[PDB]
Structure formats: C-alpha cells, structure tokens
Amino acid sequence: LADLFPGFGSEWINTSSGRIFARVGGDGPPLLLLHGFPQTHVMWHRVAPKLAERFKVIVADLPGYGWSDMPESDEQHTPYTKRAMAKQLIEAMEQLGHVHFALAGHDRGARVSYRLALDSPGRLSKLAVLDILPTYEYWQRMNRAYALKIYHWSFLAQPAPLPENLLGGDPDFYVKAKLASWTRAGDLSAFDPRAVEHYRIAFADPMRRHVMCEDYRAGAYADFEHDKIDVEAGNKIPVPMLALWGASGIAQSAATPLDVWRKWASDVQGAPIESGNFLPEEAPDQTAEALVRFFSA
C-alpha cells in the first residue's frame, strides 16, 4: 500500500475502545480529519498536505475502519454509533494533548463530527461537515424516490448476516461500483489509483465489511434516535460551523443543505462545490481552500 502522506508521521493511539490509527503532519493549531464510507484516512491525501502548511493535521481512521482496531459490537451496535465513535476520538485526541480542537469530517466521519458537536461542544473550536445532512434528515426524507436513490442505508442496515453474506462473493466489484457511482463522472477517474487500492484492501476483509454494516445499522437505529431527541428538543450546535457539499452528491438530492444545517446549528455557513460525493478527492484544491479559509478565520 502506498504512502500518500509524504513526510507525515504515523501514530497508533490507545483508547478504552481500541487503537485509533492516524497520520500526523504539519504544525500549528490542531485539526482532526475524519473519513467516511467506503474509505479510510487516505481520502484526505490531496488536501492534507496543504492543510499541514497551516495546521497540526491529524488524519484518523474511524473506529473499526482502515487500520484502527475493531471493537466487538453488540445488539445496539454501540461502538459504531456516532455517539460512541465521537467519545472514542475525544479520548484519542486527549492522548495527544488535544482537549480543544478543529474538526472536519466527510460522510460517516462528518456524522461522528456533528454528533460530537451536539454531545460535547466544548471540545471544538470550529466544525466542518462535508457531503452530508444529519442522519435524522435523511430518514425523514424517506419516500419512494429517496428509497430508490439511496438504497444502501436500508440494505446495509438489515440484520446480520444478510448484507455480510451478499458482499462476500465479489467485494471488489461492490466497493469499486460504489466509489465510481458516487462521483460526478460516474467512474474512478477522480481517485488516485493508489487510494482506490487502500479502499479495496480494507473492503476485502470480512471483519472490516462487518464494521461498515454495523455503522449503517447504528445509522438506522441508535444514531437516528439520538438525532431525534435533539431535533425534538430544538437543540442546535453552537460551534461555528461550515457545511460543504458536492452539487451532484446526495446531500442536496431533495433538500437545500444550508437551510437544513441552519435548523441544526446557530452559526453555520455553507457552499456547494461542483463534485459528486467525494469532495476532497474530486475537488481537492477548492476543498482545501475552503477549509483553510474557514479554520483560519
């Protein structure tokens, strides 16, 4: 597997829930970057070096993803809920001496990030979420058209071992089709082939695929319920926030993303970027710029 972060160090950080793997680079204010599905920390490789010119950049594998440990799940999928992932990543940052930091997340990692902001706003100076609406908002928008357009939220959330067994026969095909289909152009051209190999190797491990299904099971159940409590309480994130999304991604599928986030946060700015669902790879210069500008302000 290629080293896509030339000069960055590597850390295996202990937490009560297992080790978090991270690449670490740069210097300055602390900035944690969190990937999503079906990727690993290396999805940040085209923006992390630029960010590292201004920040101490921590590029972490989510709990159970990449090279992070995989805690055993339970009937409520607890370790792969965004609430639990956020707690674990807070522990990991404390191991490095970071008790207040900047955070940008993409996809599942962005879900960890806004949940972190709702549960523990004191931990964050500023927050960026990329290519998402809150989990509650996707489920509220569930109708025939949305069900057909983003089937995998219900598919991967089916009780084990149904999706696990379906994914086993030809995992390469499934993950490569997902990566391609969620891009602007519908192919793999937006990705560094070396990055695709990272994603493919991760997805080739049945234990890693099980974690991804547990992630989506949490997304269908406890994560949704946690979100529901906040929205029905009128709780908003007070942390200064940035929302970025690909204009061809599913966050804007049947919604105006900045309007959605204004329901969830009291100090949020936002913008689209011409891209599918993989902003930091499809539009790295624009993404990196928007992030540097936001976290520097």
- Contact residues for Cl ion, defined by CB under 5 A: 107
Q: Which of 233, 43, 25, 223 is CA-nearest to residue 131?
A: 43
Contacted entry of Cl ion, a copy of itself, none for residue 107, CB cut-off 5 to 8 Å set by kind: Cl ion
Q: Which of 121, 60, 127 is CA-nearest to residue 89?
A: 60
Q: Which two tokens mark 183?
A: 């891009």
Binders of a copy of itself among residues 218 to 237 (CB under 8 A) are: 220, 224
Report how far apart, in Å, the C-alpha atoms of 234 and of each of 126, 133, 227, 262 are: 21, 16, 11, 12
Which position among 1, 99, 142, 185 is part of the footprint of a copy of itself (CB under 8 A)?
142
How many residues interact with a copy of itself (rule CB under 8 A)? 25
**DSSP state letters, 101-157:** EEEEEETHHHHHHHHHHHH-GGGEEEEEEES---HHHHHHT-SHHHHHHSTHHHHTT
**Position of minimal CB gap to Cl ion:** 107
Which position among 72, 148, 233, 259 is part of the footprint of a copy of itself (CB under 8 A)?
148
Q: Report the nearest approach of a copy of itself to the CB of residue 76 (Å).
A: 15
Rounded CA separation 25/79 (Å):
28
The site string for a copy of itself over 253-292 (x = CB under 8 A, - otherwise) reads ----------------------------------------
- Closest to a copy of itself by CB, 11 vs 223, is 223
Residue 265: strand pairing partners: 237
- Closest to a copy of itself by CB, 99 vs 147, is 147
Q: Report the nearest approach of a copy of itself to the CB of residue 194 (Å).
A: 25
What φ, ψ does residue 186 adopt, rounded to 5°? 80, 15
* 144 is a contact residue toward a copy of itself (CB under 8 A): yes
CA-based torsion, 157, 178, 251, 123: positive or negative: positive
Rounded CA separation 64/73 (Å):
10
Q: Angle between the 193-203 and 206-220 helix axes, to the nearest 10 degrees?
A: 80
* Tokens 């295996």 -> residue: 12
Q: Report the nearest approach of a copy of itself to the CB of residue 159 (Å).
A: 9
Q: Report the nearest approach of a copy of itself to the CB of residue 215 (Å).
A: 15
* 147 is a contact residue toward a copy of itself (CB under 8 A): yes
Q: Report the nearest approach of a copy of itself to the CB of residue 138 (Å).
A: 9
Contacted entry of Cl ion, a copy of itself, none for residue 122, CB cut-off 5 to 8 Å set by kind: none
Contacted entry of Cl ion, a copy of itself, none for residue 266, CB cut-off 5 to 8 Å set by kind: none
Burial of 143 (0-12, 13-18, 19+ CB in 10 A): exposed
Q: Angle between the 206-220 and 222-233 helix axes, to the nearest 10 degrees?
A: 30
Q: Which two tokens mark 8?
A: 């960055």
* 177 is a contact residue toward a copy of itself (CB under 8 A): yes
Determine the interface stretch with a copy of itself among 30-38, 143-151, 204-212, 254-262 (rule: CB under 8 A). 143-151
* 205 is a contact residue toward a copy of itself (CB under 8 A): no
* 187 is a contact residue toward a copy of itself (CB under 8 A): no
Q: Contact positions toward a copy of itself, by CB under 8 A?
A: 139-140, 142-144, 147-148, 151, 153-155, 157-158, 162, 165-170, 173-174, 177, 220, 224
